[PDB]
Symmetry: C8
Subunit: 182 residues, 8 copies
């Protein structure tokens, strides 16, 4: 009989749902990824993988001694409950290895936190899910609590830090083992 | 009897539909297509095909050694569920062949992803659906996961990459076989 | 009896109609018409015809060797379902002929597409409906799919292209038969 | 009995009427009138008449060889269905005649179109309704379809054009009979 | 009984009245009054009268050979149906007379039009209602239809014009009888 | 019984009252008070009184030959029906007297108008209500109708004027008796 | 029974209360406190107390001969009925005393007014409630009515003034007894 | 029966709750932390801990004699009732100790106030909850009431101050024991 009650229930439902989708569309995640080639070797064949999120730009094809990658990963547009998570990688012909760098800026800080890592892999490889799993679970990732340092092997080491924010910054310097960081 | 219930159902219907059409009108797709003539040959007769989308500008008629195409493909205006997908092509008189470059930035990332390709075709040809089908299905397109390289034949090769975003960037360098990319 | 139902039907009707007229008022059509006098002859008596649309400016009275027309045709203001369609023309005293250039940027891309053309006509003539019909139906117009070239006769040729967008650009170079375009 | 139906009919009526008056207040008409004194004689006693519309500025009192009038006629403010229509005039002591220039930018392009004219009148006269009627009905006005030229007599001629838009531009050059226009 | 009908009649009444007062508050009248002392005599004791309207600034105390008054009369703020109407005056010690300048920019162009005047009065006098009545009714005011000229006596003359707009401009040059205006 | 009629009467009452308080909060009064020390004596101990209104700034402590006070009195914030009315004063040690300057910019121009005055008082005194009453009622204030001049005594005179607007300007020059104003 | 009357009473209540809290959040109080060290002694250990309000900045640690404190006290954010009231203090090692400066910009000008003071206290002390009570009640504070001057003792004096506005300015110069203020 | 009362109770509930969450999302807390290395020793391995809040940036890896940390802690985004509270730390190789600096800008000033501290700890340590507890409860923190100074030991001391605002500033200078602060 009282069909106006069903119309009012629809107006309440879409009036809630349009604002709920507008919330998930407006919560934002970023990672300003800076990686600095202090290494004395040329990096090439710039490769990426995204477990979540995207970027609007390319990596440099190559990086050379004293220059840096700057890259801007972000969350996918629209009402998605996913952060920005991924790998970037470069081949290093002068040592026969691939440098891979991982970051993980989640959506829910109830369950997760900002993590990052870097490693050298044998031969020419490009960033994929097996690099994400190995950099996130098998290796020890670093968390967003200031500056950390580790040997890469093959005469290199990395020094780096990440913000605890969801609009994060990541900075890494890939030095020779002889050098003092920053 | 209660005609106000039909008026309230119409207000609910158009109140939903005006916002649904406003959604499809505001989700946007782009491809910033850069193609760089490192080739040592003049390109001419700049031609295009669009399977979906448009651009507000012309290609250069010609490109010459060390200059680049910059072109801005985009989605068609209004409430359409179509991305930007197309071909650009140039004749190369010095080798008797047509360079064609393809990109595909879809609407639904549920079903599709960003793809691109480039190839040399025999004689003077202009971009059309047969170049789109051959660059997308018969040849192997490259996906949006960093830098890729392939020989074109006739002394040329291409090196290029594409963003995974729907507001994409595409960059290609069309080098001689003797050269090192970027 | 229930006169409030007629008032609510009027509020629904004008609430729809004010938004429908606002839609047709906001969908826009343009043609940025550039025509370049590479011809070695002075053009004069700049004339126009509009089958649909207008412009807020005059043509140059005359154009001379190495200068260009730039002209901005547009859709008529308000809730009209018409594009921008027209002819511009110039007399060329040094050959005894009229150059006429046509463009057609439609409203409905369901039924129509962007077309353009150029031709030389005998004697001093000014742009009118007979030039529109002859440039659109009797001659072969060119479509918005990259660069096209044709001989005009009397020692001239044209080279030109048009955008597939509804906010189009048109570019034409009117060269001598001896020259290489752009 | 049901007085709320009369209140709802009043809210509908003023809700329509406030938007109808806002429409007529926002449709705009202009004429950017440029008149260029290439004549070799000083013009003085700058006079105006408006059949419809106004301007917020004065004419120059005088114009001299190689300078120009620039004048900005416009529609009267508020919800009026009238365009901008008028005459400007100057006395020319060196020939004993008055130059008068007319323009007519209508409201309804359903019934009317953009017209303009210019003429020389005997003795010192100022712009009035008899100049409007003689320039619009008795003389042949020119329409908004590109550049037109006519002899004034007394060793002068005019060359000029007008836009077909309702936010029009009018340009006139008042040359000696010896000269080539623009 | 049905007191909600009286509340709805009040909401309709104040909903109309707030918009009616907002209309009368937003219709604006101005006069940009420029008066230029080409006279060879110093003007002093700058005086004003307003029959309607105000200004936010002072006159210069004095004006001297080759300088000008610029003054910005305007309508009184808020929902008043009155224009800007007034007199400015200066004493001229070198001839023993007061220059007075009048303007009248009305509210209703249904009943009134833009008028202005200027005159010399005997001795040191300051602008008041008797100067307004004598400049508007007893003397012949000039209307807003281009440039007008008259002798003041005492070796002076004025040349001037006014806009027909309600946001008017008034320009007057107060020359010696020997000179040619502007 | 029908308690919704009392709620609707409250919504009408606060819907009116919030707009009435917003009106009294937005009608504004100012006085840009400029006072110029052409006097050849130093002024010091800058003092103020406000009968209505305030300022956000201090007076200069002192003023010296050829410098000026600039001061910006204004209406008190919020829904108050009061203008800006007050006194500023300075001691002049070189003559043993206090200069006091008064202004009165009212709220209701139905009952009041812009008045101002200046006077010299014996000894070191600071601005207070007895200076306001003596400058406004016992002395002859000047009204907002152009430039006025009066002797102060002790070898000084003042020359000054005030705007008739509620956002007024006041300008005063405090000269020696030997000098000609502005 | 009629539960919609309780919902309408809640909508009226929160519709009033959200606007009442927005009023108390938007009425603002400030004191731009400038204190100028004309004293010939270094000030150090810059200390503060707030009876009401806060600032977003630090005092200078120290001030030295010819430099000034500039400090911006303000009201606490949100719907609080409290002004800005406080003390700033500095130790002066060269005389063995603490300079303390007090200001009081209230919320309710119905009950209170702008007051300020300054004094020298024995030994190294920091601003607290006992300095506020002694500067406000036991000593004679100065009110916002122009420039005031007093001896501090120990060879110093202060000269200063405060605005009567709630967005106040306070200026104080701390001179030697030999000097003439500003 | 009357289901519209439940819909109206839902509209009231979400209409309140959307504004309550918007309040907690818009109340903001910051700490602009400046720490100045006047110490004559290099600081390195910049480390952080957050008990509440985040930052969008990294610390410098290292700081050296005469340079400063500038760091911008802030509240976590969205409707959370938590301030910004944390520790930053650096290792100092030249003395074998870790400098740690703490700040605490709360949400509820009903229960808490702005506190800060600094201390030297033995060996290379990184900021964590045990440094927060020791700097906040076991050591004596300083409150937001002007400049404070303390010996660190190992030849160093700190001098610093903090704002009482919730958008706070913190400034610390880490001097040698020989020096005079700021
Ligand atoms: C309930 C929440 C828990 C749902 C859990 C987990 C994640 O797998 C993904 C995206 O992960 P991420 O980008 O947020 O962070 C990166 C975390 N890893 C890198 C994977 C370790 N969430 C969703 O699909 C949202 C599901 C739908 C949630 C609505
Ligand atoms: C609602 C439709 C109202 C809106 C908008 C028009 O302005 C643009 C014009 O598109 P354009 O400027 O990019 O030109 C591209 C056209 N070509 C690709 C070159 C063929 N929409 C279309 O044409 C088709 C949309 C048609 C919309 C499809 C129907 C949606 C449901 C109604
Ligand atoms: C259901 C969705 C599935 C509908 C499928 C497919 C596409 O054919 C086209 C436009 O394709 P595209 O521009 O998005 O991407 C390019 C993809 N290819 C390049 C063709 C390979 N979609 C539509 O006509 C929307 C239909 C109406 C959808 C509403
Ligand atoms: C149904 C749509 C079909 C209606 C058809 C055709 C056109 O004649 C004109 C304006 O044409 P045009 O400016 O859009 O494009 C140019 C096309 N030609 C150059 C003429 C070839 N449309 C209207 O009068 C809108 C009618 C009313 C449509 C509402
Ligand atoms: C029905 C429309 C037809 C009403 C007709 C004609 C015009 O007389 C005038 C103003 O003319 P104009 O400024 O628009 O254009 C200039 C046209 N002439 C220069 C006169 C030739 N219109 C009105 O008074 C609006 C009447 C009221 C229309 C509502
Ligand atoms: C509603 C009234 C609320 C509004 C506004 C006031 O701010 C201005 C002040 O005008 P003013 O700043 O230009 O000073 C000019 C006054 N003089 C010419 C110098 C005498 N309105 C008036 O004074 C009279 C308006 C009075 C409005 C007349 C009554 C309208 C109906 C209520
Ligand atoms: C009915 C309209 C007719 C009402 C008539 C006449 C005028 O006296 C004054 C203000 O005149 P003015 O400033 O507009 O123009 C200047 C005109 N003179 C210089 C006086 C010649 N109007 C009002 O008081 C509005 C009355 C109330 C109108 C509402
Ligand atoms: C509603 C009241 C809410 C509003 C606003 C306050 O912010 C300003 C402060 O004024 P002020 O910043 O200019 O300082 C000038 C005060 N003195 C002149 C120096 C004494 N209003 C008042 O004080 C009195 C207004 C009181 C309003 C009078 C009552 C109106 C009806 C409620
Ligand atoms: C009824 C209006 C008549 C109410 C009268 C008079 C004035 O005493 C004061 C403020 O005066 P003033 O600042 O506006 O102008 C200055 C005028 N004097 C300098 C005093 C000569 N008004 C109020 O308290 C508003 C009362 C409440 C009005 C509401
Ligand atoms: C009723 C109003 C009267 C309430 C009275 C007095 C004041 O104690 C404090 C804050 O004072 P203050 O910052 O405004 O001004 C400074 C005044 N002294 C410096 C203290 C002298 N007001 C409140 O707590 C608001 C109470 C709640 C008022 C709502
Ligand atoms: C009831 C309020 C009282 C709730 C109490 C205390 C705090 O533990 C935390 C966050 O503290 P803080 O960042 O605000 O300030 C720092 C204070 N300490 C540094 C811890 C000393 N509050 C909450 O979790 C909000 C609980 C939910 C409150 C809603």
């Amino acid at each position: 009989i009282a069909a106006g009650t069903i119309i009012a229930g629809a107006e309440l439902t879409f009036g809630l749902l349009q604002n709920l989708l507008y919330f998930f569309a407006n919560v934002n995640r970023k990672c300003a990824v800076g990686v600095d080639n202090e290494s004395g070797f040329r990096w090439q064949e710039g490769s990426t993988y995204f477990f979540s999120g995207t970027a609007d730009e390319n990596l440099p094809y190559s990086v050379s001694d004293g220059y840096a990658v700057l890259y801007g990963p972000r969350k996918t547009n629209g009402p998605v409950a996913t952060g920005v998570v991924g790998v970037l990688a470069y081949y290093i012909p002068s040592i026969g290895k691939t440098l891979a760098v991982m970051w993980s800026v989640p959506f829910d800080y109830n369950f997760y936190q900002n993590w990052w890592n870097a490693k050298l892999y044998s031969g020419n490889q490009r960033a994929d899910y097996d690099h994400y799993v190995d950099l996130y679970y098998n290796a020890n990732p670093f968390k967003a609590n200031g500056w950390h340092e580790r040997s890469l092997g093959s005469g290199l080491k990395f020094c780096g830090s990440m913000s605890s924010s969801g609009q994060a910054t990541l900075e890494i310097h890939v030095l020779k083992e002889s050098e003092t960081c920053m």
